[PDB]
Amino acid sequence: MVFQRLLQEQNFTESTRWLRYIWNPAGYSVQGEMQDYYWNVRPLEEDT
Amino acid sequence: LLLTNISFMSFSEFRHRTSGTLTWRETDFL
Numbered sequence: 001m002v003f004q005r006l007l008q009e010q011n012f013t014e015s016t017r018w019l020r021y022i023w024n025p026a027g028y029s030v031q032g033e034m035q036d037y038y039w040n041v042r043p044l045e046e047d048t
Numbered sequence: 049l050l051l052t053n054i055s056f057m058s059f060s061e062f063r064h065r066t067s068g069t070l071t072w073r074e075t076d077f078l
Contacts, residue, residue: 032059 054078 003022006015021040028035039045054062063075070078 032063034060 051078 003015003018006012006018022044023039025038027038028040037045042048049065057065059076062078063072066075
């Protein structure tokens, strides 16, 4: 909802951050090291 | 490897550099 509402107001550099909170094709960095997943929402990794 | 070289590399690069002799508290401190 925050992502879509930031697209609709064309605040792009924050809209992309709020999309990084779910999906990042450039991986995720936890404690300095890159992780093995790309979905920051665990019922999207496991089909729950 | 001096203290100016460590600032250019990331923490993952620097931790892979010293993963044997240091143990992630001296690594993060340095």
